[PDB]
Amino acid sequence: KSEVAHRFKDLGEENFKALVLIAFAQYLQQCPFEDHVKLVNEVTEFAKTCVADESAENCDKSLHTLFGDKLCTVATLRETYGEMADCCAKQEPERNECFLQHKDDNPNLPRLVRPEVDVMCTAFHDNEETFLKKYLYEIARRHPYFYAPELLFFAKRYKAAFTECCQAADKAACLLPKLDELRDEGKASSAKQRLKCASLQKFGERAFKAWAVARLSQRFPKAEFAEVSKLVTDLTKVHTECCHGDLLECADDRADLAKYICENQDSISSKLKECCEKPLLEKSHCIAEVENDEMPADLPSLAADFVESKDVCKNYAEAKDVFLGMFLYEYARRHPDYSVVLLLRLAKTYETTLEKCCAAADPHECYAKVFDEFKPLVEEPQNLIKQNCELFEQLGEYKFQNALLVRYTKKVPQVSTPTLVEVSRNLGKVGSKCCKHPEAKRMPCAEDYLSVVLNQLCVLHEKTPVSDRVTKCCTESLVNRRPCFSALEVDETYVPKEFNAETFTFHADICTLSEKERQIKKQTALVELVKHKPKATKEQLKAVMDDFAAFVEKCCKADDKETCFAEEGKKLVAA
Ligand SMILES: N[C@@H](Cc1cc(I)c(Oc2cc(I)c(O)c(I)c2)c(I)c1)C(=O)O
Ligand SMILES: N[C@@H](Cc1cc(I)c(Oc2cc(I)c(O)c(I)c2)c(I)c1)C(=O)O
Ligand SMILES: N[C@@H](Cc1cc(I)c(Oc2cc(I)c(O)c(I)c2)c(I)c1)C(=O)O
Numbered sequence: 001k002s003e004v005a006h007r008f009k010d011l012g013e014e015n016f017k018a019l020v021l022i023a024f025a026q027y028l029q030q031c032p033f034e035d036h037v038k039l040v041n042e043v044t045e046f047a048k049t050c051v052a053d054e055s056a057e058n059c060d061k062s063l064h065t066l067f068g069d070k071l072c073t074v075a076t077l078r079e080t081y082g083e084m085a086d087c088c089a090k091q092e093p094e095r096n097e098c099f100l101q102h103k104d105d106n107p108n109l110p111r112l113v114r115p116e117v118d119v120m121c122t123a124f125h126d127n128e129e130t131f132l133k134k135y136l137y138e139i140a141r142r143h144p145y146f147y148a149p150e151l152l153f154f155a156k157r158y159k160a161a162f163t164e165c166c167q168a169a170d171k172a173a174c175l176l177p178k179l180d181e182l183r184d185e186g187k188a189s190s191a192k193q194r195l196k197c198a199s200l201q202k203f204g205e206r207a208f209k210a211w212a213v214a215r216l217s218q219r220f221p222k223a224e225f226a227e228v229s230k231l232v233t234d235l236t237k238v239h240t241e242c243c244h245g246d247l248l249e250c251a252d253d254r255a256d257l258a259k260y261i262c263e264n265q266d267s268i269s270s271k272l273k274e275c276c277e278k279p280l281l282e283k284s285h286c287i288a289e290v291e292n293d294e295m296p297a298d299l300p301s302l303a304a305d306f307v308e309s310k311d312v313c314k315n316y317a318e319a320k321d322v323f324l325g326m327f328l329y330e331y332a333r334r335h336p337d338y339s340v341v342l343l344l345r346l347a348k349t350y351e352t353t354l355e356k357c358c359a360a361a362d363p364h365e366c367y368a369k370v371f372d373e374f375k376p377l378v379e380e381p382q383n384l385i386k387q388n389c390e391l392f393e394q395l396g397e398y399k400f401q402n403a404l405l406v407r408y409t410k411k412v413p414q415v416s417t418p419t420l421v422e423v424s425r426n427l428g429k430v431g432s433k434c435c436k437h438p439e440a441k442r443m444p445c446a447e448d449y450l451s452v453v454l455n456q457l458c459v460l461h462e463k464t465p466v467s468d469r470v471t472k473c474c475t476e477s478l479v480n481r482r483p484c485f486s487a488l489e490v491d492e493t494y495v496p497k498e499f500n501a502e503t504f505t506f507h508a509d510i511c512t513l514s515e516k517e518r519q520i521k522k523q524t525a526l527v528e529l530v531k532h533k534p535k536a537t538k539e540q541l542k543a544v545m546d547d548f549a550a551f552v553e554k555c556c557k558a559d560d561k562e563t564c565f566a567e568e569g570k571k572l573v574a575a
């Protein structure tokens, strides 16, 4: 009856406050921290009165009306430059649609640099409650599409490392190796969910369902099609709600789905035994990455049910959604060595062929050779991941990253330098992640990872579009994004970039760089070099790059660093 009371009773006061805090920080990523907590406390205050009596006033209002009204009380900024939506001047459901609108994927915010080790322990034992909420606020506003129930699981692992290393002799040896892991998997998890949200909002519900049908069929190849279909239906509702700002409903229905899977293991998978004995947050996280089950032994051939049968065109006419879903389910459950986007490519080819052949004379003869068309679609990814692992093994991660950085800069040189650097580094991480697997698990690992990193490129670029060819590859076909970018060649409509020199101004931090920060500086410099001389050969690029690095060398060792960079730098500009 009263929706705010229902969610308060299902989740408990702990997770209720955390989810509402995450919700407000993703809609207003600019807002001060202490200003958010004040709004979260008035929520919890009013929800308790509705639990006491559901006919108390305003208790019959929707969550969108309650959350939307609180956010509209304070959130003023400054200059608009004549262009800025007024979500608070709109009614529901238009107002919420205006909030999801203003989610910023790349916002200016001070780069969180850890204070020293001994003061975080002072701040944990400060106001513990206030310390944990700063962890959620600071990451939610930087990742406004972060999977909400999974962020609660990281807040618990974050609290566990503080209650185990602050009470030790040596702290930094206990902590820091546990904080850097939490922010690595934290950033893997964020980009993963961004691809799901991007699918739902930009390609529709039917595209996401087909994606989850293929993936759950690989994980649970012994389950019946009716069992896979119910799982997909529940899973789509969950991600639709998280991706639309209904975080209370999203967490609630996710606990329901885990409870359903654990009490039906004997018709789903035999690998859910250990995950189902874990506590709640641990549980859904364990199911999220359980491994593939054993494939059934003597499954019948695919060509019997989809090529040779006389009822092919009949079944496709009388029930196309069930028939085409059946094709995808049967093909994926026996090809765990295929990537998801490859499997979706095959089903797309199968449906196009049927629409043509079933409208002609003798359809049985028309589509009889449809597996011939799958052969080229399968070999292209296999050979591509073949050569990158060879290059990775030979070069190493940093040199592998630089090789990908150069050719992507040559494909889309209009893309900004910060975006090109971060994307190229993430592309190069696939070698470390996948090339160590046998030559069978590689493509499931690799191609589905590249889809995540390329989606990052798409959403970073659409905010400020500059490259016509990026816009093309991003908006045409979701499942064809990776073959789209790989087929791009060097762009010759691009005019060489002017030299600027402001990129190389001296800073006191360049002579005490960590190994990681040193690589980022050189990659940035390499991008700007390719943009300025797009026809420079790769032998000429090394000579110029080696010369500049040696210039940075000695000057970091001179009597006056800042005079060396100014004096010697002027000679290089006028050379
Ligand atoms: N490569 C894919 C693999 C994968 C996707 C989904 I979709 C899924 O089904 C669930 C069930 C629950 I419960 C969840 O909380 C989530 I998230 C997904 C499962 I199992 C595995 C990925 O990126 O996940
Ligand atoms: N010596 C190799 C040449 C080669 C260079 C690169 I750099 C490379 O890495 C990528 C990664 C992605 I992702 C792409 O879309 C593309 I195009 C290339 C690969 I694999 C091969 C040969 O002779 O085959
Ligand atoms: N302007 C920045 C600092 C900055 C100075 C330099 I000098 C520089 O150029 C190189 C080139 C190579 I090649 C290197 O290996 C290295 I280390 C630095 C870069 I990129 C950045 C700021 O104000 O914060």
Ligand SMILES: N[C@@H](Cc1cc(I)c(Oc2cc(I)c(O)c(I)c2)c(I)c1)C(=O)O
Pocket (backbone or CB within 6 Å): 499, 500, 525, 526, 527, 528, 529, 530, 532, 533, 544, 545, 548, 572, 573, 574, 575
């Ligand atoms: N002297 C030229 C201008 C010019 C200055 C530099 I300094 C330079 O060397 C680099 C090295 C790296 I590494 C870069 O990322 C870049 I951009 C330029 C080059 I080639 C040309 C003129 O008179 O027009």
